């Protein structure tokens, strides 16, 4: 039920990551030669360009957007042990740098809007840092708030998008160390209001192979959570709280339709279709059937 098309865009070098905005009208593509671009769209249905600049001293890995109720903020992280914040004055300018790392930075993500304007950043040394902006007037003033150690090399992070009044803020981080020894790879933390700190919640001991990406699912008023893991086989979990908070953990998907290593995972707006891009050059979409069973619903070739 899914078709393909080719978008009319020209790029000089290989692309590394692509992200969208809230409404789905803008775009940002980090490239190989340390250049990022903005791709705006018109009523007719075509993409034009608006900006292009060089940012870091090394390869740029991931870029992401921020909620419109704060501005037109972006975020990028590179191998040069830095992560920068941009804005829009029709020329983007730099407003802050995060130099407090001592090794390559691999991921940067924006916290949900319902808790202010915060930022999460993990390094290869095995540490995550939670930043914040006390005022939404000055984007040059940031403060380090929390510090979490994982004791393992970090590869991916993800926030919990739930915005209920009975769900504490929680984060998840995965590892990719290829050691012969068997150890847990995915960890989950949560923030305790009474003591104001982040504590370990659960460790998915069922996973020992390296993990390359992790993504949560928009809650949309559900009674549990959904998580997806990107490893030698795509896995889908289900974390449900039992009245740190105890959780019940299950498995509902162990697809092997790649014969390779999956590399990226991303959900849609409602939280019912999944996208997986592997090492065979094809993108496959999955979706739950009419009997709460996950069955593949389309193969797309590059």
């Amino acid at each position: 039920m899914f078709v393909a098309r080719s978008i009319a865009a020209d790029h000089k070098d290989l692309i590394h990551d692509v992200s969208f905005d809230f409404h789905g009208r803008r775009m940002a593509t980090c490239s190989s030669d340390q250049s990022v671009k903005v791709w705006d769209k018109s009523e007719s249905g075509d993409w034009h360009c608006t900006a292009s600049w060089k940012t870091h001293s090394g390869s740029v890995w991931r870029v992401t957007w921020a909620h419109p109720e704060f501005g037109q903020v972006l975020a990028s992280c590179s191998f040069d042990r830095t992560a920068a914040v941009w804005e829009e004055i029709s020329h983007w300018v730099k407003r802050t740098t995060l130099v407090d790392s001592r090794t390559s930075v691999t991921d940067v993500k924006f916290a949900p809007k319902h808790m202010g304007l915060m930022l999460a950043t993990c390094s290869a040394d095995g540490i995550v840092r939670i930043y914040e902006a006390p005022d939404v007037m000055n984007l040059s003033q940031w403060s380090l708030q929390h510090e979490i150690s994982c004791k393992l090399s970090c590869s991916c992070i993800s926030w919990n998008p739930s915005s209920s009044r009975a769900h504490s803020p929680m984060i998840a981080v995965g590892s990719d160390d290829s050691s012969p020894n068997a150890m847990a790879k995915v960890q989950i933390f949560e923030y305790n209001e009474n003591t104001r700190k982040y504590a370990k919640a659960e460790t998915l001991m069922t996973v020992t192979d390296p993990v390359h990406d992790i993504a949560f699912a928009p809650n949309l008023g559900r009674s549990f959570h959904i998580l997806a893991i990107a490893t030698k086989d795509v896995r889908i979990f289900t974390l449900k709280p039992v009245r740190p908070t105890k959780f019940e953990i299950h498995i509902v998907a162990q697809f092997d339709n790649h014969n390779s290593q999956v590399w990226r995972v991303s959900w849609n707006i409602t939280g019912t279709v999944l996208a997986s891009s592997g090492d065979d050059g094809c993108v496959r979409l999955w979706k739950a059937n009419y009997m709460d069973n996950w069955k593949c619903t389309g193969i797309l070739k590059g």
Binding site: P68, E69, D135, V136, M137
Partner: protein, 112 residues
């Protein structure tokens, strides 16, 4: 004399352009007699600063479009009966086709 004649014929867009450019001090200062407003925040009932759009106590965007739900940095149309409003043209377009307040408070904001 020129300004009075212009105001008789109801041409404000030129009358005020004369005041903006006129070389006399009194006529230039004639533009700034009680032409500044004071706006506070309805959640906390405290006056706001001069160059900001966020409340310093509640820490929430007090100037939100009732229609487009974005931040209003520029012009802000306001209603004196229910204290709801937003962007100029958004509200003007909305009221053309309906007679209810966009915020949804049961107020006929034009007396029908």
């Amino acid at each position: 004399s020129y300004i009075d004649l212009l105001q008789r014929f109801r041409l404000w867009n030129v009358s005020n352009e004369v005041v903006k450019l006129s070389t006399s001090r009194a006529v230039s200062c004639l533009n700034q007699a009680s032409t500044t407003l004071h706006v506070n925040c309805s959640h906390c009932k405290r006056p706001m600063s001069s160059r900001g759009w966020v409340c310093d106590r509640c820490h929430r965007c007090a100037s939100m479009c009732a229609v487009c739900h974005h931040v209003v940095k520029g012009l802000f149309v306001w209603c004196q009966g229910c204290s709801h409003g937003g962007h100029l043209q958004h509200i003007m377009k909305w009221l053309e086709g309906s007679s209810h307040c966009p915020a949804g408070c049961g107020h006929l904001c034009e007396y029908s």
